[PDB]
């Protein structure tokens, strides 16, 4: 029975920390929408500020996940630092509008492919836009997006975990909840295909970690303190 209510807790946790494309007033900008640059500073400033705030939103989401706060502070930090890009990339990809080929941030900022590139994505742009298209046939809702976010975060295969077996005891209920949820919505083999989307994400976010190092060379000043903190070796 626990499985039926775990779904609603993770769905509610996701809905409070990530407003859907439904309830967002879109707005756009005109600068750097035609030519590809190495880095548009004005877009980078907004992009990094919006990233810092969604990182804070991820921490808030993590704290609502059943069992996450029972882990040690060191493990909570380790899991959050390791899954930060994954959850960020997954979130912005679920705000992809196919007809416009755009992505909408939490304040309504709506950017096209070239602007996503110029904001800092760089050579990652086509990888991120391809993933957001591969998510479309899954018809994801807030319960599924929160469950894959939780599953990516509560991962006992992360390096330097103090109690990995405990982390993994928390992830197995999350996997069962997603398996049951996709059986209740209704392609007929949805559950393994969603897990495979996690493999793509993780691969993308590892390449994102490399892009962070290249970004530090190209950006004017320094990275915001929280991002520099989350993404460090």
């Amino acid at each position: 029975p626990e499985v039926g209510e775990l779904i609603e807790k993770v769905r509610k946790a996701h809905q409070e920390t990530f407003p859907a494309l439904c309830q967002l007033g879109k707005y756009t900008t005109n600068n750097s929408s035609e030519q590809r640059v190495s880095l548009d500073i004005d877009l980078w400033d907004k992009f990094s500020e919006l990233s810092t705030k969604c990182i804070i939103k991820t921490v808030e989401f993590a704290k609502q996940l059943p069992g996450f706060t029972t882990l040690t502070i060191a493990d909570q930090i380790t899991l959050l630092k390791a899954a930060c890009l994954d959850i960020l990339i997954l979130r912005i990809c679920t705000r992809y509008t196919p007809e416009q080929d755009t992505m909408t941030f939490s304040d309504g900022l709506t950017l096209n492919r070239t602007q996503m590139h110029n904001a800092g994505f760089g050579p990652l742009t086509d990888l991120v836009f391809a993933f957001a298209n591969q998510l479309l046939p899954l018809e994801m809702d807030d319960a599924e997006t929160g469950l894959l976010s939780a599953i990516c975060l509560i991962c006992g295969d992360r390096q330097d975990l103090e109690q990995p077996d405990r982390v993994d005891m928390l992830q197995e209920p999350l996997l069962e909840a997603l398996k049951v949820y996709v059986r209740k919505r209704r392609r007929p083999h949805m559950f393994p295909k969603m897990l495979m989307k996690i493999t793509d994400l993780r691969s993308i976010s590892a390449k994102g970690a490399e892009r962070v190092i290249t970004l530090k060379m190209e950006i004017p000043g320094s990275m915001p303190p929280l991002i520099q903190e989350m993404l460090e070796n």
Partner: peptide
Amino acid sequence: HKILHRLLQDSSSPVDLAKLTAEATG
């Protein structure tokens, strides 16, 4: 590290979160 710790081990409030957000953004 320094800000993630305070965001996690945080007694909730809009005032404390507003301060940590300011430190997080710089």
